[PDB]
Structures are given as C-alpha cells and as structure tokens.
Amino acid sequence: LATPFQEYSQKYENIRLERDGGVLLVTVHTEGKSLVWTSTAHDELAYCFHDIACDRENKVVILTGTGPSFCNEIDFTSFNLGTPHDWDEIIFEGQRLLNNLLSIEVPVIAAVNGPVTNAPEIPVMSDIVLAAESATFQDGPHFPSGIVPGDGAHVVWPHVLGSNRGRYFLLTGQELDARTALDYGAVNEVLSEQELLPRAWELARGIAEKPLLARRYARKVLTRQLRRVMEADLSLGLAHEALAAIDLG
Amino acid sequence: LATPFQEYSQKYENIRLERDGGVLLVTVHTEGKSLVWTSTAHDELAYCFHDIACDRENKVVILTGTGPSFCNEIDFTSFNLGTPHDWDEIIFEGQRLLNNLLSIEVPVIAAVNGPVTNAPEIPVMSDIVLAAESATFQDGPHFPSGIVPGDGAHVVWPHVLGSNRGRYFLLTGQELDARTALDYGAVNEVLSEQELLPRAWELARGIAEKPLLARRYARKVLTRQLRRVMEADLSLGLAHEALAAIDL
Amino acid sequence: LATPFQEYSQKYENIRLERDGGVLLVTVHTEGKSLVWTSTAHDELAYCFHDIACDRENKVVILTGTGPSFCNEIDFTSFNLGTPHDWDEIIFEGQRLLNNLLSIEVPVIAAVNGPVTNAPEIPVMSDIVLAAESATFQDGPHFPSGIVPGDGAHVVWPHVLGSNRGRYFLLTGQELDARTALDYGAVNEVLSEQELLPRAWELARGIAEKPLLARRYARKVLTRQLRRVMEADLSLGLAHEALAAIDL
Numbered sequence: 001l002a003t004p005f006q007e008y009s010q011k012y013e014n015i016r017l018e019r020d021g022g023v024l025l026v027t028v029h030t031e032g033k034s035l036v037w038t039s040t041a042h043d044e045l046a047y048c049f050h051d052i053a054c055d056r057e058n059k060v061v062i063l064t065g066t067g068p069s070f071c072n073e074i075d076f077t078s079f080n081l082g083t084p085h086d087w088d089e090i091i092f093e094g095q096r097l098l099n100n101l102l103s104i105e106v107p108v109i110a111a112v113n114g115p116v117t118n119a120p121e122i123p124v125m126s127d128i129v130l131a132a133e134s135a136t137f138q139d140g141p142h143f144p145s146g147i148v149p150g151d152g153a154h155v156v157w158p159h160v161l162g163s164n165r166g167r168y169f170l171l172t173g174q175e176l177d178a179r180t181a182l183d184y185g186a187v188n189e190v191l192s193e194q195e196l197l198p199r200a201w202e203l204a205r206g207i208a209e210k211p212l213l214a215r216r217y218a219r220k221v222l223t224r225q226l227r228r229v230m231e232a233d234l235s236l237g238l239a240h241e242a243l244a245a246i247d248l249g
Numbered sequence: 250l251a252t253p254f255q256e257y258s259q260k261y262e263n264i265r266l267e268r269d270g271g272v273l274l275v276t277v278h279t280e281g282k283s284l285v286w287t288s289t290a291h292d293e294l295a296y297c298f299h300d301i302a303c304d305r306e307n308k309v310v311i312l313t314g315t316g317p318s319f320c321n322e323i324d325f326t327s328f329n330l331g332t333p334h335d336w337d338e339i340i341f342e343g344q345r346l347l348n349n350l351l352s353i354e355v356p357v358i359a360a361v362n363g364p365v366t367n368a369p370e371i372p373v374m375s376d377i378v379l380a381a382e383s384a385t386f387q388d389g390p391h392f393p394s395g396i397v398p399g400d401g402a403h404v405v406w407p408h409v410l411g412s413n414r415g416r417y418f419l420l421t422g423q424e425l426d427a428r429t430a431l432d433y434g435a436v437n438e439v440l441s442e443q444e445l446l447p448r449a450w451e452l453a454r455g456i457a458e459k460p461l462l463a464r465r466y467a468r469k470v471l472t473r474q475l476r477r478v479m480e481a482d483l484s485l486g487l488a489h490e491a492l493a494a495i496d497l
Numbered sequence: 498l499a500t501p502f503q504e505y506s507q508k509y510e511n512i513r514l515e516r517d518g519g520v521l522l523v524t525v526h527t528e529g530k531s532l533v534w535t536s537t538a539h540d541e542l543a544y545c546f547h548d549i550a551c552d553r554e555n556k557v558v559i560l561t562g563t564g565p566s567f568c569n570e571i572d573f574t575s576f577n578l579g580t581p582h583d584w585d586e587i588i589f590e591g592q593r594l595l596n597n598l599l600s601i602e603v604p605v606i607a608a609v610n611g612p613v614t615n616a617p618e619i620p621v622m623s624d625i626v627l628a629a630e631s632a633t634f635q636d637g638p639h640f641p642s643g644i645v646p647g648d649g650a651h652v653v654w655p656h657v658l659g660s661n662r663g664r665y666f667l668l669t670g671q672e673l674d675a676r677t678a679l680d681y682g683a684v685n686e687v688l689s690e691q692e693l694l695p696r697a698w699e700l701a702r703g704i705a706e707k708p709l710l711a712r713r714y715a716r717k718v719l720t721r722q723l724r725r726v727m728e729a730d731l732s733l734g735l736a737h738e739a740l741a742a743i744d745l
C-alpha cells in the first residue's frame with residue numbers, strides 16, 4: 001500500500017529523485033537551476049518527505065541543491081499570507097514538512113552546494129551536514145522581512161547553534177559562511193565544490209552497507225530530542241507567525 | 250491599570266530608565282557608579298522587569314551598566330541568609346527576578362560594559378549579547394563563597410555554554426574574558442568600549458522598526474526552551490541553596 | 498545499612514578504589530594495565546557507582562584509568578548478544594550503569610589518561626573533564642561494529658557536543674583528539690600526562706573543602722537536564738539497539 005519509488009520519483013517538479021544501491025539523492029531545483037523558494041516547493045517537500053519516509057527501499061538520504069546556490073531566492077507572490085484560512089494551509093503543510101522530515105527513519109546527509117537563505121533549517125536538521133566552501137546560511141524570509149521566525153526556524157537554530165547564537169542569528173539577519181557554520185557546529189565538513197557530492201556519496205555508501213536495523217535505528221535513537229522540542233514548540237510558532245503576518249495587512 | 254513609564258521610570262534607585270522611540274535603555278548603577286550588588290538591587294530588578302513587561306510602549310530593551318564594570322562588587326551584609334523565613338523572601342523574589350525577565354515579550358539586548366561577577370546570568374539570558382573588550386563573566390557569589398549556584402545560575406550556564414562547560418564554569422571559579430565568552434557562544438559580538446552602546450542602539454533601532462506583532466512574537470517563540478527549563482529547575486535550586494546556606 | 502567504604506573498596510576486580518580526606522579515586526584497570534572492556538567491567542561499574550552514591554563519606558570522586566589508555570580495547574566474546582533474554586540483562590545493567598552514575602550526589606572529576614573507545618560517555622558525563630594530551634574519544638563498539646549507539650551514547654554525545662556534532666560523531670566513526678574535544682566543549686582542560694592526576698587532586702581537594710551541603714547540592718542542581726533526557730531516552734535506545742543486534 002506504500003507508494004513505491006517508481007510512482008513518486010517523477011511526481012515533484014522541484015525535486016529530482018535518483019536512487020542507486022538504496023542511496024536516495026534528493027536534488028532541489030527550479031527547472032534545473034538553483035531552487036527558487038515557493039509555495040509549490042514547500043508543499044512538494046512535505047509530500048516528498050512523506051513518500052521517502054514510507055519507502056523502505058531508501059537506505060540513506062542525501063539532500064542537495066544544484067547550481068551555485070542551494071536556495072537563495074524566494075517568490076513571496078507564490079504564497080497567500082493575508083487571512084487565517086490561507087495561513088492554515090501553510091501551517092498544516094509547514095507542520096507536515098518538518099514532521100515528515102523527522103519521520104524519515106534512515107540517516108540523512110545534507111550536501112549544501114552554495115547559499116541557503118530560504119528554509120536553511122532543512123539541511124541543518126540532517127544527521128551529517130556537508131557544506132561547499134561557498135555555502136552560507138541565513139534565515140532570509142522571516143525577521144529581515146518583518147515576519148516571525150515561527151516555522152521551525154525558532155526550534156532548530158537555538159537547538160543546533162545554542163541558545164544565544166541561535167536567537168542572535170534569527171534576530172539580526174546574520175549570514176554564516178561555511179567556516180563559521182563549521183565552527184558553530186551546524187556543519188560537520190567543509191569541502192570544495194567538486195569534492196562535495198563525491199563525499200556525500202562516500203559517506204552514504206558506507207552507511208548503506210551497515211545492517212538494515214542498525215542503520216534505521218541509529219537514525220531513530222538520534223532524533224529523539226529534536227522531535228520532542230518540535231512537538232512542544234512548532235505549532236505555537238506557526239500560529240504566532242500567522243497572526244503577526246495577518247496584522248501587516 | 251499597568252504602571253505607565255512616567256511613574257516607574259523614576260521608582261528604582263539602582264536602575265536608570267530612559268526611553269526614546271520605544272527603545273528602552275536600562276542602566277544599572279549605584280549612585281551613578283558601577284552597580285554594587287545588594288538585596289535592594291536584586292529586588293528592584295524583579296519589580297522593574299515586571300513593569301517593563303507590562304508596558305507595551307517598550308518596543309525593545311537594552312540592558313547595560315555604567316563605569317568600568319557591569320557588576321563586579323557585592324555587599325553580602327545587605328542580605329539576610331541565616332534562616333528559612335529570610336531565605337523564603339529571597340526565593341520568592343529570586344523567582345520573580347528571572348521569571349519577570351522572561352515574561353518581557355520584546356527582544357532584549359545586553360550591552361556588557363565590563364566585568365560582571367554578580368548575576369551574570371541576567372545579561373546572558375538576553376536575545377542578543379554584546380560585550381565590551383573588557384567584559385568578563387564569573388559566577389562570583391555562589392561556589393567561591395561556599396554557596397550553591399542554585400538561583401538560576403545552574404539553569405542558565407549549562408543551557409548557554411553546554412553541559413560540561415557550564416558545570417565546570419560553576420564549580421571551578423572560572424572567569425570568562427570577552428573573547429572566550431564569544432567563542433563559547435554566550436556572547437554574540439565583542440566591541441570596543443566606545444562602540445558598545447552605539448552598536449546596541451543600532452540593533453535596537455532596527456528591531457524597533459519591525460512590525461509590532463512580529464517583534465513581540467519573535468521574542469515569545471524564541472524563549473520557549475529557557476522558560477521550560479527555568480520552570481522545571483529554578484525553585485528546586487533555590488530551595489537546596491537555602492538549605493545549604495542555613496547549614497553554614 | 499549502607500555498605501561502608503571498608504566493605505566495597507576491595508569488591509571489584511576492574512576498579513581500584515582509594516580514598517584520602519574524602520576524595521575518592523576510582524581507577525579502572527585490567528590486572529593493573531589499561532582497562533579492557535568486558536561484561537564484568539560494565540556490570541562492576543554499575544554496582545560500584547551505586548556503592549559510591551550511597552556512601553556519604555565520599556566528598557568528591559575522581560574517575561581515571563591507568564597506563565597508556567583509559568579504555569581502548571574490548572572483549573566482545575565476554576558479552577552475550579544473541580537473544581532477547583540475554584539483552585535484557587545488558588539493558589537492565591546498562592540502565593543501572595548510567596543511572597547509578599547520575600545518582601552520585603558529589604562532584605565527579607574525570608581524568609582521561611589516554612584513548613577511550615569504549616564507554617567514553619562515562620568520563621564525559623562528569624562535572625569536570627580533564628584530559629591528557631594523548632586522550633582521544635571515539636564511540637568504538639557501536640556503529641563501527643554495526644551496532645546501534647543506543648546505550649546512552651545517543652543521549653550523551655548530542656547533549657555534550659551539540660545536535661550536529663553529536664550525531665556526526667556517532668555515525669562516522671569520528672575520533673576526537675584531546676584538543677578537538679576541548680574545542681567542542683566535551684573537555685575542560687588538556688594537561689600533560691604527568692600533570693593530569695596532580696591537577697585532578699588539586700581540584701578535588703579544593704572542592705572537598707567546601708561546605709558539606711553546598712558541595713553535595715552543587716552536583717544535584719547541575720545534573721537536572723542530563724537526568725531528564727536520560728530518563729526520556731535511554732531505555733528506548735537500549736531496546737532498539739537490542740532488536741537490531743539480535744537481527745544480526
């Protein structure tokens with residue numbers, strides 16, 4: 001009854017999906033160029049993470065982008081931000097986006113190929129975070145645009161960076177370069193652009209060779225605290241964010 | 250019903266309060282010199298943080314000191330530490346001090362103008378922590394004086410520095426200089442003394458210009474974990490600290 | 498009713514116990530050489546930590562190893578890993594090992610004298626962590642052997658290193674050298690091999706001179722968050738580890 005890979009691999013216009021030897025490579029893109037963040041990309045990721053989670057033939061996941069950026073452009077006009085009922089669609093799919101990600105029960109490796117200023121919390125939620133020398137991280141579309149960082153940004157960044165670095169990062173428009181993200185512990189390795197994906201594949205293949213349950217349960221036992229805090233705080237954030245945003249108009 | 254700024258701005262002998270365009274500058278001091286930590290200062294800050302939290306015209310808060318230190322002197326004689334009933338007055342206000350601070354629903358920026366050895370947890374609870382080059386941080390009046398660090402120090406330092414740095418900091422008398430505090434992630438920027446307040450103002454102004462509810466809710470959504478652990482552990486620490494102190 | 502020191506000090510074949518002025522030195526070893534990790538050493542540590550926790554004459558604890566390594570050799574054949582009932586014995590004692598450790602209500606100092614690749618979470622759960630220049634840390638016997646790091650490794654390493662460093666450390670076979678552990682905040686001081694134990698004793702003696710209840714309650718107020726997450730997550734990890742291991 002689960003959707004096998006042959007049925008969802010071609011379902012998402014902003015998500016290329018390729019699998020070899022059980023290693024699933026997820027590449028986010030807009031027509032083969034670097035991803036432009038939209039309502040569609042947001043909702044596709046939520047549905048796609050569900051499909052990935054429920055497909056037991058995925059042994060390990062690599063999340064990456066294409067071209068010079070991971071995602072450093074947004075189309076705010078693709079979203080409807082004016083009313084509560086419009087925001088409820090965002091809240092419902094925004095919960096699904098992060099919760100479906102956390103429901104994936106294999107290790108997730110991020111390969112951040114350049115700047116990410118929209119949804120940077122997604123790659124940094126990964127178990128292993130690899131960054132190109134050119135990678136940067138910024139919470140672009142929230143407080144710099146007068147929007148509350150209430151969509152999980154508020155959970156992930158204090159969780160990964162620490163309390164003070166996390167709050168400062170979210171309130172001051174801070175952009176972390178690759179080596180700063182490494183120093184702060186958000187990134188595990190900084191690699192040249194050409195080395196990045198080969199390294200992601202190397203690590204993924206080694207993990208995929210580990211015993212079935214050891215691999216799946218390693219992921220499961222390691223996501224406990226993030227799941228606890230996300231359940232405690234995510235919906236609270238989203239509802240406050242929606243209220244503040246509706247006040248704008 | 251809330252006390253307006255015109256009434257509370259002049260209420261507290263150790264806290265100067267000045268507000269311009271909704272940016273509230275809170276300057277702790279003893280007679281215009283660097284703050285000397287006392288029972289009065291402790292209790293005033295608790296009452297003052299309540300007034301600040303309840304006054305919606307505060308858009309953003311800057312907490313700072315004056316002179317060469319933020320707070321690096323204490324008068325232990327100003328406190329009554331000998332009996333349970335005396336300790337309950339400290340426990341009650343000590344709870345209010347940190348809970349009232351967390352009840353403020355606008356962003357709080359700390360500008361640490363020099364050494365802080367008493368109540369350093371207060372500035373480091375801020376959303377943005379700026380330090381002068383001369384700033385230092387030490388949990389002065391707890392374990393070095395044979396007193397349990399049970400007043401919220403035990404919550405804040407492991408939370409912000411991490412488990413092993415936090416516990417070591419509290420048990421060994423460690424003093425963090427500004428660049429070590431920066432490296433440990435307790436401080437966000439280290440500035441020259443003359444740039445410190447200008448930078449705090451620049452950040453505050455920028456925040457104050459954000460939309461009303463975005464600015465308020467940013468603070469709310471970001472203090473969840475600290476509020477959870479403070480509720481779980483603060484009163485426990487204070488009661489144990491009182492017991493050990495009375496045993497002296 | 499509690500076992501005094503004169504009755505448990507000689508009980509354990511892999512744990513030497515010496516006490517001077519209330520400072521208890523716990524030295525893990527295999528016939529006077531560096532500890533080889535076994536089922537015996539694991540269960541002994543669980544019982545030993547209980548004895549130490551219940552003995553009020555322990556004022557401070559130093560945990561250390563001997564020789565070139567703290568513990569960098571394991572005997573997998575000493576363990577029975579094939580069936581659920583065998584795994585229940587490991588789960589039950591594995592819970593006791595870490596829970597008994599956390600139940601100790603005096604400050605715990607680790608003095609990591611060299612490489613630790615088995616049970617490295619034990620020393621890093623200490624309040625003060627001192628490492629020789631030659632110390633290294635690695636989660637040896639879990640994921641590199643195709644075994645889930647579900648025995649507390651999953652709690653401790655994300656807790657002390659942070660979410661991303663902790664997960665990466667457990668999933669990639671990473672070995673931290675002493676200065677990397679220091680930078681990551683898992684270690685507080687790095688010392689020469691000759692300086693290590695003298696520094697542990699220096700710190701322990703200083704702590705031991707603090708007032709009785711202040712010393713005891715300092716430990717108690719500082720272990721809250723670790724105790725909370727261990728209770729939330731330890732048994733979940735052990736049961737999943739057991740299931741995966743039996744599937745082999």
Ligand SMILES: C[C@@H]1C(=O)C[C@@H](CC(O)O)C1(C)C
Pocket residue numbers: 038039042079090094141147150151241
């Ligand atoms: C860019 C953002 C999301 O993708 C959906 C909205 C809510 C969110 O995730 O913060 C947004 C602000 C438009």
Ligand SMILES: C[C@@H]1C(=O)C[C@@H](CC(O)O)C1(C)C
Pocket residue numbers: 286287291328339343390396399400490
């Ligand atoms: C300096 C300290 C406080 O201000 C009140 C007392 C309890 C506390 O906060 O730790 C004290 C020990 C006198």
Ligand SMILES: C[C@@H]1C(=O)C[C@@H](CC(O)O)C1(C)C
Pocket residue numbers: 535539576587591615638644647648738
């Ligand atoms: C080395 C390990 C422990 O000491 C007991 C077993 C379970 C564990 O993970 O603690 C083990 C895998 C043999």
Ligand SMILES: [Ca+2]
Pocket residue numbers: 183184432433434680681
């Ligand atoms: Ca660091």
